[PDB]
Amino acid sequence: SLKWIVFLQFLIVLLLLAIVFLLR
Amino acid sequence: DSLKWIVFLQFLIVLLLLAIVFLLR
Amino acid sequence: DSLKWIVFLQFLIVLLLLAIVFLLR
Amino acid sequence: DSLKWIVFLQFLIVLLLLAIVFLL
Amino acid sequence: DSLKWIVFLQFLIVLLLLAIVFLLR
């Protein structure tokens, strides 16, 4: 489960990067 | 247990973040 | 317990993202 | 000490999301 | 060290949320 927790954290960071890019 | 709920909630968060990206785009 | 608090705060994060989605529409 | 910091950072994330909700 | 990755990613999330707050107003 920890592997998937870390992987989904990766995904969340990438999506937040997309959101910050769109706001800019 | 707790970790399964963490994974499920993180998946829900991913879906919601995708929805926010779609709304912004 | 740390894990229970993490799960509950994850649930709150899900609620907050839902509220953000509602506000964006 | 990792779990303590994870809980604290989750709390910070909740606070920041609340700030964003108020701003919106 | 999965926990160290989790902490680092959480800190990244905090920084991105601070940037979002700055961009909002």
Whether A3 and E2 lie within 8 Å, measured CB to CB: yes
What is the identity of the amino acid at C25?
A: R
The domain of C4 spans 1-25
Q: Write down the experimental method used for this entry.
A: X-ray
**How many residues would you count in chain E?**
25
Nearest to A8 by CA among D13, C18, B8: B8
Query: How many domains is chain B built from?
Result: 1
Tell me which H or E stretch contains A8: helix A2-23
Calpha distance C16→C10 (Å, rounded): 10
Helix axes C2-24, D2-23, angle to 10 degrees: 20
Tallying the residues shown for chain A, one arrives at: 24
Tokens 């680092």, located at residue: E8
CB contact under 8 A, E23 and A19: no
| Distance in Å, alpha carbon of B23 to nearest chain A alpha carbon | 10
Show the tokens assigned to D6.
Answer: 């994870």
Q: Which residues contact E25 (CB under 8 A, 6 or more apart)?
A: D23
In angstroms, rounded to a whole number, what is the distance separating the alpha carbons of residues C24 and A11?
22
Helix (H, G, I), strand (E, B) or coil at B16: helix
**Cβ proximity of C7 and B6 under 8 Å:** yes
